[PDB]
Amino acid sequence: VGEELLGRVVDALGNAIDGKGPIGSKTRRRVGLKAPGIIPRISVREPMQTGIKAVDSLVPIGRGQRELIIGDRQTGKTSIAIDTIINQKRFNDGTDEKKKLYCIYVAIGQKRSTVAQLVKRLTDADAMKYTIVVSATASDAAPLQYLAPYSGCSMGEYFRDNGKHALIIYDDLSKQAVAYRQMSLLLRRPPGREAYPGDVFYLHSRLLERAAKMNDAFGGGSLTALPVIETQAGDVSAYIPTNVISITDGQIFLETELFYKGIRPAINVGLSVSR
Amino acid sequence: SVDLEETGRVLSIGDGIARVHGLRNVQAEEMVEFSSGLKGMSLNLEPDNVGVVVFGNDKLIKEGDIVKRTGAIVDVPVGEELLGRVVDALGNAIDGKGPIGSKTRRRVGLKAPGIIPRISVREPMQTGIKAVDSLVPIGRGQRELIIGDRQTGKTSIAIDTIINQKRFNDGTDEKKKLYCIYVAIGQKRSTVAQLVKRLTDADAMKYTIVVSATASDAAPLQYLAPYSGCSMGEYFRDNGKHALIIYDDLSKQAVAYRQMSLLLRRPPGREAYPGDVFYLHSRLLERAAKMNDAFGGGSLTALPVIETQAGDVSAYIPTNVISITDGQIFLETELFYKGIRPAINVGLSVSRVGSAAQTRAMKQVAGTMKLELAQYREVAADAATQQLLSRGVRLTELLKQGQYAPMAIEEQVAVIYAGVRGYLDKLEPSKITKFENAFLSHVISQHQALLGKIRADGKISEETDAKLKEIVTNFLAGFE
Amino acid sequence: AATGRIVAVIGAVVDVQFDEGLPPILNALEVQGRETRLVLEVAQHLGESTVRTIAMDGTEGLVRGQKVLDSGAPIKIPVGPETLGRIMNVIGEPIDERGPIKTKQFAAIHAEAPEFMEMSVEQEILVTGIKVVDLLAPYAKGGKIGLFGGAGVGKTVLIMELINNVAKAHGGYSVFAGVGERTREGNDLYHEMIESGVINLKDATSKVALVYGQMNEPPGARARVALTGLTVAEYFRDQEGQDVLLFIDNIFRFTQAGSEVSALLGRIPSAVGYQPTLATDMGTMQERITTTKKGSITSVQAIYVPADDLTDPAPATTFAHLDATTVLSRAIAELGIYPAVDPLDSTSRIMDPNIVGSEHYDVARGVQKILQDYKSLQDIIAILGMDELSEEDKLTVSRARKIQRFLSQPFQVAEVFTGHLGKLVPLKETIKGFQQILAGEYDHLPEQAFYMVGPIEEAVAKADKLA
Amino acid sequence: AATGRIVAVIGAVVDVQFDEGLPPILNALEVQGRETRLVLEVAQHLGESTVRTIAMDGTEGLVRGQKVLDSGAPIKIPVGPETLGRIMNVI
Numbered sequence A: 001v002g003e004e005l006l007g008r009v010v011d012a013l014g015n016a017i018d019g020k021g022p023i024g025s026k027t028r029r030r031v032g033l034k035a036p037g038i039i040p041r042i043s044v045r046e047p048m049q050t051g052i053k054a055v056d057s058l059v060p061i062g063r064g065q066r067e068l069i070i071g072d073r074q075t076g077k078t079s080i081a082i083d084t085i086i087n088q089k090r091f092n093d094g095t096d097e098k099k100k101l102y103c104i105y106v107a108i109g110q111k112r113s114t115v116a117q118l119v120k121r122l123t124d125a126d127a128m129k130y131t132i133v134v135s136a137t138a139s140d141a142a143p144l145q146y147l148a149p150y151s152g153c154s155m156g157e158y159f160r161d162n163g164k165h166a167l168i169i170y171d172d173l174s175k176q177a178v179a180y181r182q183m184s185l186l187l188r189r190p191p192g193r194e195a196y197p198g199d200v201f202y203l204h205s206r207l208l209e210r211a212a213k214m215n216d217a218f219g220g221g222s223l224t225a226l227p228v229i230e231t232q233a234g235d236v237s238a239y240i241p242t243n244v245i246s247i248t249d250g251q252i253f254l255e256t257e258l259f260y261k262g263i264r265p266a267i268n269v270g271l272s273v274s275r
Numbered sequence B: 001s002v003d004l005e006e007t008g009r010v011l012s013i014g015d016g017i018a019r020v021h022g023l024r025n026v027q028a029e030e031m032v033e034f035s036s037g038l039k040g041m042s043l044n045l046e047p048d049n050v051g052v053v054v055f056g057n058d059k060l061i062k063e064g065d066i067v068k069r070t071g072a073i074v075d076v077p078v079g080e081e082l083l084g085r086v087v088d089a090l091g092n093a094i095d096g097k098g099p100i101g102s103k104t105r106r107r108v109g110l111k112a113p114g115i116i117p118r119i120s121v122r123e124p125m126q127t128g129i130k131a132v133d134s135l136v137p138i139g140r141g142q143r144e145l146i147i148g149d150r151q152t153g154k155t156s157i158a159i160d161t162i163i164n165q166k167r168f169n170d171g172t173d174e175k176k177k178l179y180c181i182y183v184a185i186g187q188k189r190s191t192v193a194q195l196v197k198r199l200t201d202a203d204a205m206k207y208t209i210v211v212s213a214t215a216s217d218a219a220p221l222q223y224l225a226p227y228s229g230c231s232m233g234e235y236f237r238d239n240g241k242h243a244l245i246i247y248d249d250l251s252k253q254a255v256a257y258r259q260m261s262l263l264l265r266r267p268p269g270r271e272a273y274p275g276d277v278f279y280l281h282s283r284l285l286e287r288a289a290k291m292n293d294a295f296g297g298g299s300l301t302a303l304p305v306i307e308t309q310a311g312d313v314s315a316y317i318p319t320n321v322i323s324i325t326d327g328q329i330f331l332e333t334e335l336f337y338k339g340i341r342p343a344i345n346v347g348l349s350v351s352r353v354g355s356a357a358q359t360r361a362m363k364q365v366a367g368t369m370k371l372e373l374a375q376y377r378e379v380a381a382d383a384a385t386q387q388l389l390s391r392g393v394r395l396t397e398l399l400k401q402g403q404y405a406p407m408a409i410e411e412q413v414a415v416i417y418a419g420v421r422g423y424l425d426k427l428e429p430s431k432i433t434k435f436e437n438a439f440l441s442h443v444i445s446q447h448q449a450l451l452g453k454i455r456a457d458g459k460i461s462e463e464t465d466a467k468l469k470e471i472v473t474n475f476l477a478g479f480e
Numbered sequence C: 001a002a003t004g005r006i007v008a009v010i011g012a013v014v015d016v017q018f019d020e021g022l023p024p025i026l027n028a029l030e031v032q033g034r035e036t037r038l039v040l041e042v043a044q045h046l047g048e049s050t051v052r053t054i055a056m057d058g059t060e061g062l063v064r065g066q067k068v069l070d071s072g073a074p075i076k077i078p079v080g081p082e083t084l085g086r087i088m089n090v091i092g093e094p095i096d097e098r099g100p101i102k103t104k105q106f107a108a109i110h111a112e113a114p115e116f117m118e119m120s121v122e123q124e125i126l127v128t129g130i131k132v133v134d135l136l137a138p139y140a141k142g143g144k145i146g147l148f149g150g151a152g153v154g155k156t157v158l159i160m161e162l163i164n165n166v167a168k169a170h171g172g173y174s175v176f177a178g179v180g181e182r183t184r185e186g187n188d189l190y191h192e193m194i195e196s197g198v199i200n201l202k203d204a205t206s207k208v209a210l211v212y213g214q215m216n217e218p219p220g221a222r223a224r225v226a227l228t229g230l231t232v233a234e235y236f237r238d239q240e241g242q243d244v245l246l247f248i249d250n251i252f253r254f255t256q257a258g259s260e261v262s263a264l265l266g267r268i269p270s271a272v273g274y275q276p277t278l279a280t281d282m283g284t285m286q287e288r289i290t291t292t293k294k295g296s297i298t299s300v301q302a303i304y305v306p307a308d309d310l311t312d313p314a315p316a317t318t319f320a321h322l323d324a325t326t327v328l329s330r331a332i333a334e335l336g337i338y339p340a341v342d343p344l345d346s347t348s349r350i351m352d353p354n355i356v357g358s359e360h361y362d363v364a365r366g367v368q369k370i371l372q373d374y375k376s377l378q379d380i381i382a383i384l385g386m387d388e389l390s391e392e393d394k395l396t397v398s399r400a401r402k403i404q405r406f407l408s409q410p411f412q413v414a415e416v417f418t419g420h421l422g423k424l425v426p427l428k429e430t431i432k433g434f435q436q437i438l439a440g441e442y443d444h445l446p447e448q449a450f451y452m453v454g455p456i457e458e459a460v461a462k463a464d465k466l467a
Numbered sequence D: 001a002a003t004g005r006i007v008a009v010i011g012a013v014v015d016v017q018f019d020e021g022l023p024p025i026l027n028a029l030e031v032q033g034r035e036t037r038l039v040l041e042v043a044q045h046l047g048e049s050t051v052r053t054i055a056m057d058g059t060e061g062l063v064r065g066q067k068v069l070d071s072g073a074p075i076k077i078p079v080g081p082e083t084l085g086r087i088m089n090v091i
């Protein structure tokens, strides 16, 4: 952990795969830790700007919050996060440090060429100087895809405890549960519903609780989260999506019928909420 | 004082599977014989015991019985002495006429030929039904499926097909004769008995073989039956002869195999079927082919039959089978109820290879009928539209046949020619049948020479066309 | 190297016990005392000096106690420039009765995917001559393409049309791999490739290689053919600088064949009877078919959907490995529209204004919006009828019904059983023809004139004849 | 007619062990020491001279060790012209 990882592409265990060289770091941190309790927290009071007109005006997002992006395939989920990452340049190229934000991107289950195109898109807009990319592609072993999100949350927590603000994105949380199910079945543990393990809820509940807003006695840092979920044929009442709907503070819905009627981005304003 | 290299003792019997202690030199898939006369098949070779599948009832096997080896993989009697005999799934006669004098045996499970030994389908396979021989032709070496619900007329097509071949089989040319094989799975015995009586009456049991595994029989016997018939059919294919095989119902075989699988405690899947159902039919229907000249020139044709529930063609087994065969024939129930018999849906039925193997005359008279029927279908939902409907109704009336009465190709050609030329656009739609019957009778009893000419030449010459026009107009004028 | 003894035979799974020299995983073994060569592959180390293997051929006639010999390396096949015009099988033996294949080097089936720093990110367009694909979801060069469809809807006719239109004019080589299909189709393909001139039997000017394992083979063989094709595809990319076209027929059989042996290996089934390791072993195979900084590979794959279901676990994990999708529907095929391509369910990665241009993008978005609007009126029309609509709704219904007809097209490979003539449209004519319909210039023509024609000029002439 | 002993009672399924001989499948057995008849029908041959049966009546008050008897044939019933106008149960 540290801030020498800015501008680098690393795997799930912190090894460079971009061909630059070794990473000079001085600190290490466990991947499984407990979230802050009740005393060290404070209310959410500051804005987090994205640059999307339909979001900043009807579904505002604060610093220290969790928000869900949910929809079918080929609807536009990735481009929202990509646009959100780019927008932060006008603040990081400034003077005061109370309005800067760092970004972390985590890719789980995707193929390598898509990540290469994403990194090229980022580097031609001068945005890699303040981003960290953690990747565990489809050719890696199941334990690495199972371990990837916590390894990125532990990197995000470094800024939170030193008076700085950070942002994290977990792409396709649906593809971590399949790796967990594969890993558990080969250990001869009994299955459950759809052969998922008996405690898939606890897999995500201990993960999404680590984003918080700290009070002045601890520094004043913050950490924000934006998970992603995919549904089959627009079925929001399935097993996995209902678990994660009841954990977050809000959700944004995307639909195909609005996509084909010229409404892009296809945000359904009649159902999207922000608590 | 017993050996354990070629002898065993039963340790447990139940759920079909019998576990035997001993037999240390047995081979995988080798026939073994019990002490009561029953026979089994070795399936699972394990470090301690062997699993055996019994081909019969399980009340005749007791713990402690002695099992002995035979020394061969499962095989069946094959030859030409089987013609005219009713046998079981293992080759034992059940007609009470004496033993079979076979001299050769062949394995039940053998791989199909490959890419090099094959060639394209060129020779025609005549049925006798006007709709099939005109709109969905079949060639020698092709797989065609007969799909439909219950009580629609699936078996009658096969029964009519078998009877027609007597014309060629009783002739002199040895390159136009076809042998036939019929396999019954999961039926009722009375139906088979009546079927064989029907076949006997028309002198068609002189070139036919029957294999039977009825409802009362055990599941493995209803699972082994088709391959046994396939091998007997394959005998002819490799000796420069032609054959035909008809599997009555593959769905009941699938049900029997599912029963067998579940008692072995294997993971179920969709509709509780095992995951190897596809391979079970993929092996069987790949053994019909058309050999090239260097390998002899034989053929083997197959016609599987499948039943659906409420016309659901998007199920597991029906979709599985469609991805194997080379075409399908659809039989509907509404047409059967309203009166159209045989009830074939022309819109859905298709043949991929039969089109190449078709007589020139039939092609000449069939193409126009196909186009006109398409137009009539499209307008069914001014003067020209009325003309289309008027032609369509009569064309539909023409394509109706009775039962147990195949026809020759030339008669079909003449009958279709009459309709396509528009000569029958004056008779009321209720009088088409009588005119067809009377015209056919007159032609058969009075000329016969133009029929011989059409048959020999294989094409409708201009002079023949003029003569046909003369005959038809004269008879129509005298119809009254 | 070392000898073992067979201890158990169940179906297509065999266990061997070694006194000394335990072989490593993925090595090949040879059986002693058989007429035809039989090869086994190591899969697991059980314990007490025992391994569990998978056979690549039939296992009838095996006896406990028989001898098994070790080789020392994975399966190796002949690879090089002398495989053009020949036919191989799973373990690289010629089945075209023309003698042995004399190449200089060999290669192993199992390898590893290219690393992250070898990827290329260039994008272009490929023109196919088919209106729906070019207008709505265009292809690209050096990308992955998939064709989804049920049973009897027409995937292989489209694959043969694409072969006829693209393969002939290509300057590089081509590879065709057939997995779990009909044999007679392979024979037809071989004979027609002999007739065309792609395969030449008297010289060295062939430009295609063929690998086959069909639906008459045991499941062990059908689980390994695609890698045999992949190896000969990769040799022409790495050692030589060439552009390669790879066609794979029904890659779905690669997944199904793997679940027929999962139960015998002693695993717990996950869902709908599939094996627990379904995504990882597909990701291992798919990541090798890519484009690197040494060459390019263009892939066209046919995929199967069981019981017309797109939510089945097998075809629902292949969407993430593609750059262009084409979905076929049975309902459209019922209405008589060929090819039966669904226009509201097909996507491509290069449909953006900065690659294809502004005009093309505007036309595509307009036609998709018009198609979407007409679908939302079906319930009212199906009961109340056409009379309840206002004038604008009737106009949109007429224009959408006119647009639906113009998307069909006659293929050249189907002329034999359709009685038509093949057509091939350039891109500009399609763009202009759809612009003209969107502008309302042809509102005075019957809707039956836009059926099974090529360029727009053929619609007015067919309408003129049909007065 | 050999004699066996009850070794397990689980609901309506009973297991019997025989010292010598073994009744074939689909045979009927008789249980001794009850106020009313109680027949059992053989279903499987587990092994170690033990069989698994099903019960044709209530199963309570049985003890692990009660003696059993083998009839030698499946269930037999009266058949003839004196069955007209009567009522009989399964056995």
Ligand SMILES: Nc1ncnc2c1ncn2[C@@H]1O[C@H](COP(=O)(O)OP(=O)(O)OP(=O)(O)O)[C@@H](O)[C@H]1O
Pocket (backbone or CB within 6 Å): A072, A073, A074, A075, A076, A077, A078, A079, A080, A264, A265, C348, C349, C351, C352
């Ligand atoms: N605002 C927009 N305007 C135009 N095109 C857009 C817009 N947003 C998204 N798209 C297009 O939508 C398509 C899908 O976008 P995206 O890659 O974000 O989808 P996704 O939800 O991540 O899909 P997948 O499940 O494949 O990962 C792309 O072709 C993209 O260019």
Ligand SMILES: Nc1ncnc2c1ncn2[C@@H]1O[C@H](COP(=O)(O)OP(=O)(O)OP(=O)(O)O)[C@@H](O)[C@H]1O
Pocket (backbone or CB within 6 Å): B149, B150, B151, B152, B153, B154, B155, B156, B157, B341, B342, B401, B402, B403
């Ligand atoms: N062309 C025909 N003319 C008159 N009756 C016919 C005709 N074809 C079939 N039938 C009648 O239809 C009935 C069903 O015959 P068939 O056994 O062929 O049907 P099926 O659908 O195969 O039946 P099942 O499902 O019971 O096997 C019989 O009563 C038969 O006489």
Ligand SMILES: Nc1ncnc2c1ncn2[C@@H]1O[C@H](COP(=O)(O)OP(=O)(O)O)[C@@H](O)[C@H]1O
Pocket (backbone or CB within 6 Å): B350, B351, B352, C149, C150, C151, C152, C153, C154, C155, C156, C157, C158, C338, C339, C411, C414, C418
């Ligand atoms: N472009 C087309 N024009 C006419 N008929 C077609 C076309 N495509 C498919 N068909 C119909 O589909 C059948 C072939 O289906 P096929 O391509 O084998 O399906 P699949 O690829 O799913 O096996 C043909 O008999 C033909 O009637």
Ligand SMILES: [Mg+2]
Pocket (backbone or CB within 6 Å): A077, A078
């Ligand atoms: Mg995405």
Ligand SMILES: [Mg+2]
Pocket (backbone or CB within 6 Å): B154, B155
């Ligand atoms: Mg029938």
Ligand SMILES: [Mg+2]
Pocket (backbone or CB within 6 Å): C155, C156
């Ligand atoms: Mg196909």
